[PDB]
Amino acid sequence: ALASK
Amino acid sequence: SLLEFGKMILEETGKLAIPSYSSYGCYCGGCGSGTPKDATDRCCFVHCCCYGNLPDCNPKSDRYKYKRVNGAIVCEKGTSCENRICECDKAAAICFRQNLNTYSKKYMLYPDFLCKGELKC
């Protein structure tokens, strides 16, 4: 998740 | 890029971008339309509006560098798009920090049909 929208 | 923004949010609020701010209210994540539900949601509305002033830039994928000067967020010199993107992200992070007190789990995974689409930036 962490790296996005 | 989303990488910098998500890190900025974590440092400021302690919450993770996803899933805390990825699908909150009507404007946090698939921001699109409706009337902002609360302060945090207004934070995203204005943030979405901030990216809107940069048509030829690419906020989601363009990376910028930034530092912390005693808790203070400082955008380092980069391209024009990078400087302006960082400024937009910086605002949202502060806005989020400013409305943590009224953040409501009641707004996580908020359904689409409940968004009364009409705020012009």
What is the SS3 string spanning B11-74? HHHCCCHHHHHCCECCCECCCCCCCCCCHHHHHHHHHHHHHHCCCCCCCCCCCCCEEEECCEEE
Q: What is the CATH number of domain B1-121?
A: 1.20.90.10
CB contact under 8 A, A4 and B19: no
Nearest-angstrom CA–CA distance, B106 and B61: 30
Provide the 3-class DSSP secondary structure of residue B117.
Answer: coil
Resolution (Å) of this entry: 2.6
Residues of B with CB under 8 A from a CB of A: 2-3, 6, 16-19, 22, 29-30, 60
Which residues fall within 8 angstroms of residue A3, CB to CB, at 6 or more apart?
B2, B3, B6
Distance, in angstroms, between B24 CA and closest chain A CA? 11
Distance of CA B21 to the CA centre of its chain: 8
Which residues fall within 8 angstroms of residue B69, CB to CB, at 6 or more apart?
none
- The answer to whether residue B47 is catalytic is yes
Which sequence spans correspond to the domains of chain B?
1-121
